[PDB]
């Protein structure tokens, strides 16, 4: 039967699945025809992560509900600040993982801290993108234009934007 | 010989969405796996970057590349026509002068066909994407959305921090 495992990048992949499928074998259909490896997949619905022996069924997972596909990787803050003249602004984000509902989870690889700034009326801009797609991923570097990537079913839309010197 | 259908206009209005408000021309590469487009903007700091997939219409048939600059103010307001759940699809020649937009929705209910003029832009399309980047976040797009949308009442200069 037809279920529905959501991808953190906006891509929720239906999956073709019978409750009486271990939960290694999703783990599996996954992998195969997306590339995921088994011990990275984080699978999390109706707020409990899924143990891999457990067969959908011993989750009562039936046809269009909705788990969450996350991945945690092996191999803190992150800070958005505006201060002007009237004032200053701070909002802290850590990255977490949702379990009710995971696509709502802050994913971080951090190579080097990074500490840049970007013109707001580009950044407005750039929000614009949201009506594409639930998430949004970002890339930051010192050494290139940071980029902003909302994902299509099967496609993409990408914004570069360049940080300010001073 | 380009025909290629979106099932909803609404994606494609929201596409463009994203070039309006920050960037005026555009070309389109058509080609045989797909649109792609690529925009920069007038201070040249953004660049605005498009690609769209064979499975991203109901159907797709483009068997030559044909490149389509347009005006995007233009183009909007003949997106307007929209309505959002009609039926529109692209369609070209071997040659373009104008590229023909085509709604219909439920059934023969109704149908509405547009032209648009295009106009020569030149082609400088550009690479910048970097293999590796210091660092790499996702979040919500609308919790994305509410921080610039708040701390741009603030100030002029969002900076970001990741440590």
């Given at each position: 039967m037809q279920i529905f495992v959501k991808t953190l990048t906006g891509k929720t992949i239906t999956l073709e699945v019978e409750s009486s499928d271990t939960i290694d074998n999703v783990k599996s259909k996954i992998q195969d025809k997306e590339?995921?490896?088994?011990?990275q997949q984080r699978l999390i619905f109706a707020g409990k992560q899924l143990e891999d022996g457990r067969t959908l069924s011993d989750y009562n997972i039936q046809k269009e509900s909705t788990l969450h596909l996350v991945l945690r990787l092996r191999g803190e803050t992150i800070k958005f600040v505006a201060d002007g003249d009237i004032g200053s602004g701070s909002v802290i984000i850590k990255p977490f993982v949702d379990m009710?509902?995971?696509?709502t989870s802050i994913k971080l690889e951090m190579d080097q801290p990074v500490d840049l700034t970007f013109g707001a009326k580009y950044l407005l801009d750039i929000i614009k993108g949201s009506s594409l797609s639930d998430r949004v991923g970002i890339r930051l570097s010192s050494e290139a234009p940071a980029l902003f990537q909302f994902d299509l079913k099967s496609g993409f839309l990408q914004f570069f934007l360049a940080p300010k010197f001073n | 010989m380009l025909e290629a259908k979106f099932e909803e206009a609404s994606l494609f209005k929201r596409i463009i969405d994203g070039f309006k408000?920050?960037?005026q021309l555009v070309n389109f590469q058509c080609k045989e796996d797909g649109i792609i487009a690529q925009a920069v903007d007038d201070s040249r700091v953004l660049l605005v970057s498009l690609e769209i997939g064979v499975?991203?219409?109901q159907e797709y048939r483009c068997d030559h590349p044909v490149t389509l600059g347009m005006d995007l103010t233009s183009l909007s307001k003949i997106l307007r026509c929209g309505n959002n759940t009609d039926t529109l699809t692209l369609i070209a020649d071997n040659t373009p002068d104008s590229i023909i937009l085509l709604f219909e929705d439920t059934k023969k209910d109704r149908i509405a066909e547009y032209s648009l003029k295009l106009m020569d832009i030149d082609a400088d399309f550009?690479?910048?994407?970097?293999?590796?980047?210091d660092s790499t976040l996702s979040l919500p797009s609308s919790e994305f959305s509410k921080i610039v949308r708040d701390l741009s009442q603030l100030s002029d200069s969002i900076n970001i921090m990741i440590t």
């Amino acid at each position: 039967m037809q279920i529905f495992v959501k991808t953190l990048t906006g891509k929720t992949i239906t999956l073709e699945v019978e409750s009486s499928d271990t939960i290694d074998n999703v783990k599996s259909k996954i992998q195969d025809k997306e590339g995921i490896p088994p011990d990275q997949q984080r699978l999390i619905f109706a707020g409990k992560q899924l143990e891999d022996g457990r067969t959908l069924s011993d989750y009562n997972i039936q046809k269009e509900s909705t788990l969450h596909l996350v991945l945690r990787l092996r191999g803190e803050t992150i800070k958005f600040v505006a201060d002007g003249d009237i004032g200053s602004g701070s909002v802290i984000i850590k990255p977490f993982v949702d379990m009710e509902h995971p696509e709502t989870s802050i994913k971080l690889e951090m190579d080097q801290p990074v500490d840049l700034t970007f013109g707001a009326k580009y950044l407005l801009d750039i929000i614009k993108g949201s009506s594409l797609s639930d998430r949004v991923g970002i890339r930051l570097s010192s050494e290139a234009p940071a980029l902003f990537q909302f994902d299509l079913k099967s496609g993409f839309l990408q914004f570069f934007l360049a940080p300010k010197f001073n | 010989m380009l025909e290629a259908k979106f099932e909803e206009a609404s994606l494609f209005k929201r596409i463009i969405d994203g070039f309006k408000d920050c960037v005026q021309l555009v070309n389109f590469q058509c080609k045989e796996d797909g649109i792609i487009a690529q925009a920069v903007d007038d201070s040249r700091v953004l660049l605005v970057s498009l690609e769209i997939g064979v499975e991203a219409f109901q159907e797709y048939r483009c068997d030559h590349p044909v490149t389509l600059g347009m005006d995007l103010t233009s183009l909007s307001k003949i997106l307007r026509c929209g309505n959002n759940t009609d039926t529109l699809t692209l369609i070209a020649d071997n040659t373009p002068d104008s590229i023909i937009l085509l709604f219909e929705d439920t059934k023969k209910d109704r149908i509405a066909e547009y032209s648009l003029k295009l106009m020569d832009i030149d082609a400088d399309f550009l690479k910048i994407e970097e293999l590796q980047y210091d660092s790499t976040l996702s979040l919500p797009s609308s919790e994305f959305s509410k921080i610039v949308r708040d701390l741009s009442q603030l100030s002029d200069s969002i900076n970001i921090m990741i440590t």
